[PDB]
Amino acid sequence: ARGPKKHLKRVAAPKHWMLDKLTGVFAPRPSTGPHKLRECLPLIIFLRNRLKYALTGDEVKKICMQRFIKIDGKVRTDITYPAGFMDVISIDKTGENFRLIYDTKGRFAVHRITPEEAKYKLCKVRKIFVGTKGIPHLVTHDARTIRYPDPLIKVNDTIQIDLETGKITDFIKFDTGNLCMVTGGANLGRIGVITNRERHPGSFDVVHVKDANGNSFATRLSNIFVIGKGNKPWISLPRGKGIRLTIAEERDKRLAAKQSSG
Amino acid sequence: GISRDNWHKRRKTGGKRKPYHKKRKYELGRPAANTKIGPRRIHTVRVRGGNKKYRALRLDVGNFSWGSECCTRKTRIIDVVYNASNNELVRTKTLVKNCIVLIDSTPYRQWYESHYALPLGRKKGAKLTPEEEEILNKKRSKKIQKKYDERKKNAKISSLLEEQFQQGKLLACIASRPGQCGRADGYVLEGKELEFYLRKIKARK
Amino acid sequence: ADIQTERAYQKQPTIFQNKKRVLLGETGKEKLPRYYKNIGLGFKTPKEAIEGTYIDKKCPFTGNVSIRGRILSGVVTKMKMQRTIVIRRDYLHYIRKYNRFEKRHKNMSVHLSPCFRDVQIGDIVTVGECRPLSKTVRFNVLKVTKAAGTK
RNA sequence: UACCUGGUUGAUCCUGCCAGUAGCAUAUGCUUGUCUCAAAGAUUAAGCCAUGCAUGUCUAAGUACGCACGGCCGGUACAGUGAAACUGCGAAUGGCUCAUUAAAUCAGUUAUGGUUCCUUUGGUCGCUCGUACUUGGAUAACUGUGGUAAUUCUAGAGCUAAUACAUGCCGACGGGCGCUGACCCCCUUCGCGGGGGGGAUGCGUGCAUUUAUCAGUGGUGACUCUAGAUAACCUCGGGCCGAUCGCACGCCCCCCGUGGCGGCGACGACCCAUUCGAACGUCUGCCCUAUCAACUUUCGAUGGUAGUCGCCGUGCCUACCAUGGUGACCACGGGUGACGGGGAAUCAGGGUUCGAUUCCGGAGAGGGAGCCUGAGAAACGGCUACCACAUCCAAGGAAGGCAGCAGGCGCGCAAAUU
RNA sequence: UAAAGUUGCUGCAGUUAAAAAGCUCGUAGUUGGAUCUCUCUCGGCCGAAGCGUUUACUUUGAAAAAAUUAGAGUGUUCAAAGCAGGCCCGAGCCGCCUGGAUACCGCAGCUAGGAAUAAUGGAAUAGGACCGCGGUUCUAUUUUGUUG
RNA sequence: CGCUACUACCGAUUGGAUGGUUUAGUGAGGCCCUCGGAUCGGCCCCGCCGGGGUCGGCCCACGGCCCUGGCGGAGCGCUGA
Ligand SMILES: [Mg+2]
Ligand SMILES: [Mg+2]
Ligand SMILES: [Mg+2]
Ligand SMILES: [Mg+2]
Ligand SMILES: [Mg+2]
Ligand SMILES: [Mg+2]
Ligand SMILES: [Mg+2]
Ligand SMILES: [Mg+2]
Ligand SMILES: [Mg+2]
Ligand SMILES: [Mg+2]
Ligand SMILES: [Mg+2]
Ligand SMILES: [Mg+2]
Ligand SMILES: [Mg+2]
Ligand SMILES: [Mg+2]
Ligand SMILES: [Mg+2]
Ligand SMILES: [Mg+2]
Ligand SMILES: [Mg+2]
Ligand SMILES: [Mg+2]
Ligand SMILES: [Mg+2]
Ligand SMILES: [Mg+2]
Ligand SMILES: [Mg+2]
Ligand SMILES: [Mg+2]
Ligand SMILES: [Mg+2]
Ligand SMILES: [Mg+2]
Ligand SMILES: [Mg+2]
Ligand SMILES: [Mg+2]
Ligand SMILES: [Mg+2]
Ligand SMILES: [Mg+2]
Ligand SMILES: [Mg+2]
Ligand SMILES: [Mg+2]
Ligand SMILES: [Mg+2]
Ligand SMILES: [Mg+2]
Ligand SMILES: [Mg+2]
Ligand SMILES: [Mg+2]
Ligand SMILES: [Mg+2]
Ligand SMILES: [Mg+2]
Ligand SMILES: [Mg+2]
Ligand SMILES: [Mg+2]
Ligand SMILES: [Mg+2]
Ligand SMILES: [Mg+2]
Ligand SMILES: [Mg+2]
Ligand SMILES: [Mg+2]
Ligand SMILES: [Mg+2]
Ligand SMILES: [Mg+2]
Ligand SMILES: [Mg+2]
Ligand SMILES: [Mg+2]
Ligand SMILES: [Mg+2]
Ligand SMILES: [Mg+2]
Ligand SMILES: [Mg+2]
Ligand SMILES: [Mg+2]
Ligand SMILES: [Mg+2]
Ligand SMILES: [Mg+2]
Ligand SMILES: [Mg+2]
């Protein structure tokens, strides 16, 4: 190509959007923004495919141009805006609040939250650097840059940001025994407690996590997001607490639910 | 046009390779900026990304640094004496990085005489002008004279630099790239490097 | 003297050797402070690099290079270029149809720093990846271990 | 479904092929009632094309004195809709084809601590001590006069705008800090001398740019990293530090003024970070061929030093040097009815063959080459030449590129509606 | 493409049916006889650091585009397909429940256990290991309440 | 050896042919550098029309110092494109 690409084939779209094959040739290409193309959820997909508010792409635009949708407290009229992990979506017309959290299957879930909880979010510290005049700067996973952070905050930590002022309230350090969620890989969407960290100089580090039921797994250090201190999360969790079931016990649960239905 | 690609080259084994695409814009090259000595003439070049490169075609002044004294001053450029890469560059008086040039000594002499309050570059005949006399022989108080006399303890310069100051021209080396940034900056040669380049210049003659 | 063999003056760019001093400190010793660095990954700096006087901008310890990427090993086969040698890497390639292997080799031209001396043909060398230093050189010698016949 | 059968002899047992058998995919012949999906000018010609269409865009928010329409006051700048034109953005995506291409493309795996990056998102934007209650000259649309056989050709004259093109202040502005420092004090000294302060007058100062020196907030496995200090520089083909637009309009004064203050947005901009990338690198991996065994190095082949050029790393190029580099583990050369993979057919277990073709990379726009603009193109529904074709002409000139959708000729065994 | 065990790695033949070089030497290639049953220190039993003489092998783990194939669910009227769907209504006029799994992905490159098999390594002119004791030269930090 | 036909081989010789390389000699066009200067402005020197201040002899007239709007002519004067 001679420059940036502007389209996205429907079969080449991320598979956690759960698009069907026969609807069209194209998929909504996410706009540039805080989150990556392969790790976001476009506003149109959430607004018509998940919530069933709109039937076509035109109705999504008609909803958005009435300034009804807010993302992290700010009105977004773009229908392909990239919304990502730990983002807050507010609809004041219906008085609804949602937080984008992966379910145990690695897909963004429709997770309703209290309006009190919708005032803050958690962010992962990606970079720490000193700028001009010796002023510290902290860069999070969602492209936020914050000046004068707490001197004890380092990389791979978690900070709580108040969405109205955009300022740090408190933080969680990356230590063994804390609660974390996996944000990528084969264990995406799982929740557990950090057991130990393996350091490989010049390469990727590996972190071992164990869930509430006692199942153990491992990921890379870049795929770990610290949620809470100890066993207590600082956010509300979806229907599944982050425990991944096997296919046999999913079948057993489904059969038990069917038997008790009716 | 001028292409600086790698696929027109032979392989490591020695066999030649057939290209699979034509010349691309991002592989281009441009004619050299042969910077001479004369009244300033600089042309700007629009480069990749929309940025600018300053293509110096003629230069006559630049700021050079006396490292031992940490004295940086803006001085005119007089002549080109040595060039490690090629001697044709000396004959045509081309200003490139790492070439040895001759610069004027007056601002450095002024700073030295205003700092240590000692003669420098003066003939043994002791002819003087009243401005220089009041610069060197000014009436100072006890405290200021105490500082100047203490400074006179460290006032000592090698014979090579002293002879160059007597000649009125210093030897300097250019550290910037005139064809890329549009300015000719450098440092004054001194120490073992000065002896090395003096030996090279003498052997060239 | 022995170092100065080119038309241009050979200097370590990060060391200022023209600092003026008193006449008492000049008499003592004209010993330039050496510039060296730790390359990381557990490799130690040879004493010949710290105490040496050679000038090499492509040396991993006293030059302007960065070691990042793959760490490989080879056997020295040719030492005939200036500050660069040719090593041979041997391996086996698996052929699925016959369930067997075939012997294959590759040749690498790598940069050898002057800090490594007494390097002979047939000894093991550990090299690290860096930016392209020339048309065919992308690796720098990090460690030298002698052959089994060392006495 | 791990499978066989006929044929050499007067008859027999073998070797061994030929023929038989079943899929699959191209063509063709005969035949054809109902419904659901559904390939389709790849193979020969990346051969040649009539005609039509395929890329254009305005919000309250850059510029409206077109009555072209339109409501009230009637000097009481501009009510509103708004053609045209200037300005801004996009046109580098998409769609088509498979000619070239054999460590090349491409796949997995790593790196950029060796670069650039429109836009989105976040951070900075009184940090500089040196007409502003708003500065200047033009150009379209429009109105008039024209030329040529001919084009999305344009020439002269009269008017008028800006977020086009330029030029430029105030304010914060009280000072602070680095050097220079006449002079004035306070201790010790009999006194010189040894100390400790204050200081008028001068120069410099913020972020980016270039060079030199010094010390050692935060980070990496590792910086010649980030930040700090000092001396200077800072391109006239010139870095930033707002002379821009809309909507609601209000609080305050010794006041009716030069009246002071104030809320949401839109546009723009130097520099960081982010997003989308792109571009160079690392390791391993590809079909036949020796009736291809030595190849590369005059004209860079392998390495070293210094430069030039480039967005950066590098024989990318230049100068001066060393004689290197590759090869029966198949180099070099040649062929391919060779774009590479994800995949497809057949298959007991192994395997054999195919992959032009809707997804991901690459290349090309009749063949070469060179460029303008732009963040991004060596772009072809952009320009400039040569080579081959080819259209109109009043012979003076002017205009070309369907391997985009249909469609036409040719080619062929071989493929659809202008 | 199978049939073709008529290209044979699995898995073919070479006395007479096609076939072993006239004979020997020999480099590269291939192949190769037995044998050998975690650690001090520094910090809070674990933490850091050296591990392993190293590999090959095997078993784990991580990262690995979708589509296709294999495969779970689901009466497209069945099926090829698709990713959908189901339940009560006194009507929910705040409708409720639920899916969009999983497996495989060669070679090469990362990760952690195993120690049989197969390579490779040590002390022989002992300038070989382990525990100590004297002689000399060269530089850095701290303590003499600070400063030379 | 004598009849009847086909394919593949040599080989007097030169045609219709194209395709691919290169030695030398020319070489369109763009780009870069050094020149060049058709033309278009701005600043000075005069002159007459016009508006603000002030100064002078002063009484509704006319000059001085600055600005200010236009118009006409010079200077191979200066400068910018
Ligand atoms: Mg395209
Ligand atoms: Mg989009
Ligand atoms: Mg090509
Ligand atoms: Mg097999
Ligand atoms: Mg018979
Ligand atoms: Mg048959
Ligand atoms: Mg019917
Ligand atoms: Mg065709
Ligand atoms: Mg074709
Ligand atoms: Mg086709
Ligand atoms: Mg089209
Ligand atoms: Mg326009
Ligand atoms: Mg554009
Ligand atoms: Mg189409
Ligand atoms: Mg790759
Ligand atoms: Mg780079
Ligand atoms: Mg950006
Ligand atoms: Mg006009
Ligand atoms: Mg502008
Ligand atoms: Mg710094
Ligand atoms: Mg270089
Ligand atoms: Mg070189
Ligand atoms: Mg081909
Ligand atoms: Mg193929
Ligand atoms: Mg099989
Ligand atoms: Mg079979
Ligand atoms: Mg394919
Ligand atoms: Mg293909
Ligand atoms: Mg073909
Ligand atoms: Mg494609
Ligand atoms: Mg192209
Ligand atoms: Mg074409
Ligand atoms: Mg064609
Ligand atoms: Mg063409
Ligand atoms: Mg643009
Ligand atoms: Mg082109
Ligand atoms: Mg076309
Ligand atoms: Mg196109
Ligand atoms: Mg067509
Ligand atoms: Mg057409
Ligand atoms: Mg057909
Ligand atoms: Mg036909
Ligand atoms: Mg077969
Ligand atoms: Mg069989
Ligand atoms: Mg068998
Ligand atoms: Mg047989
Ligand atoms: Mg026989
Ligand atoms: Mg025999
Ligand atoms: Mg042998
Ligand atoms: Mg054995
Ligand atoms: Mg994949
Ligand atoms: Mg797949
Ligand atoms: Mg030319």
UniProtKB/Swiss-Prot annotation, chain A:
Intracellular or extracellular location(s): Cytoplasm; Nucleus, Nucleolus
Pfam families to which the protein is assigned, alphabetical: 40S_S4_C, KOW, Ribosomal_S4e, RS4NT
Main location: cytoplasm
Residues bearing PTM N6-acetyllysine: 232
One GO-annotated biological process of the protein: cytoplasmic translation
Residues of the S4 RNA-binding domain: 41-103
Keywords (A to Z) from UniProt: Acetylation, Cytoplasm, Isopeptide bond, Nucleus, Ribonucleoprotein, Ribosomal protein, RNA-binding, rRNA-binding, Ubl conjugation
GO molecular function annotation: RNA binding; rRNA binding; structural constituent of ribosome
Glycyl lysine isopeptide (Lys-Gly) (interchain with G-Cter in SUMO2) cross-link site: 229
A GO CC term attached to the entry: extracellular exosome
Top-rank taxon: Eukaryota
UniProt function note: Component of the small ribosomal subunit. The ribosome is a large ribonucleoprotein complex responsible for the synthesis of proteins in the cell. Part of the small subunit (SSU) processome, first precursor of the small eukaryotic ribosomal subunit. During the assembly of the SSU processome in the nucleolus, many ribosome biogenesis factors, an RNA chaperone and ribosomal proteins associate with the nascent pre-rRNA and work in concert to generate RNA folding, modifications, rearrangements and cleavage as well as targeted degradation of pre-ribosomal RNA by the RNA exosome.
Assembly and oligomerization: Component of the small ribosomal subunit. Part of the small subunit (SSU) processome, composed of more than 70 proteins and the RNA chaperone small nucleolar RNA (snoRNA) U3. Identified in a IGF2BP1-dependent mRNP granule complex containing untranslated mRNAs.
Family: Belongs to the eukaryotic ribosomal protein eS4 family.
HAMAP family tied to this protein: Ribosomal_eS4 (MF_00485)
Protein name, per record: Small ribosomal subunit protein eS4, X isoform
Organism: Homo sapiens
Curated annotation (Swiss-Prot), chain B:
Taxonomic superkingdom: Eukaryota
Modified residues (N6-acetyllysine): 36, 127
Residues with lipidation of kind N-myristoyl glycine: 1
GO molecular function: RNA binding; structural constituent of ribosome
Topology versus the membrane: Lipid-anchor
Residues in cross-link Glycyl lysine isopeptide (Lys-Gly) (interchain with G-Cter in SUMO2): 169, 192
Stretches the record annotates as Disordered: 1-26
BP terms from Gene Ontology: cytoplasmic translation; maturation of SSU-rRNA from tricistronic rRNA transcript (SSU-rRNA, 5.8S rRNA, LSU-rRNA); ribosomal small subunit biogenesis; translation
Keyword list, A-Z: Acetylation, Cytoplasm, Isopeptide bond, Lipoprotein, Membrane, Myristate, Nucleus, Phosphoprotein, Ribonucleoprotein, Ribosomal protein, Ubl conjugation
Pfam families: Ribosomal_S8e (PF01201)
GO-annotated cellular components: cytoplasm; cytosol; cytosolic ribosome; cytosolic small ribosomal subunit; endoplasmic reticulum; extracellular exosome; focal adhesion; membrane
Name the UniProt record assigns to this protein: Small ribosomal subunit protein eS8
Organism: Homo sapiens (Human)
Swiss-Prot record, chain C:
List of residues that carry N6-acetyllysine: 37, 44, 57
GO molecular function, one term: RNA binding
One GO term (biological process): ribosomal small subunit biogenesis
Residues where Omega-N-methylarginine is found: 68
PROSITE patterns per UniProt: RIBOSOMAL_S17
One GO CC annotation: cytosolic small ribosomal subunit
InterPro entries assigned: NA-bd_OB-fold, Ribosomal_uS17, Ribosomal_uS17_arc/euk, Ribosomal_uS17_CS, Ribosomal_uS17_N
Listed SUPFAM superfamilies: Nucleic acid-binding proteins
Modification type Citrulline: residues: 21
Pfam families reported in the protein's UniProt record: Ribosomal_S17, Ribosomal_S17_N
Residue numbers bearing the N-acetylalanine modification: 1
Top-rank taxon: Eukaryota
Assembly notes: Component of the small ribosomal subunit. Part of the small subunit (SSU) processome, composed of more than 70 proteins and the RNA chaperone small nucleolar RNA (snoRNA) U3.
Protein name: Small ribosomal subunit protein uS17
Biological source species: Homo sapiens
Gene that this sequence comes from: RPS11
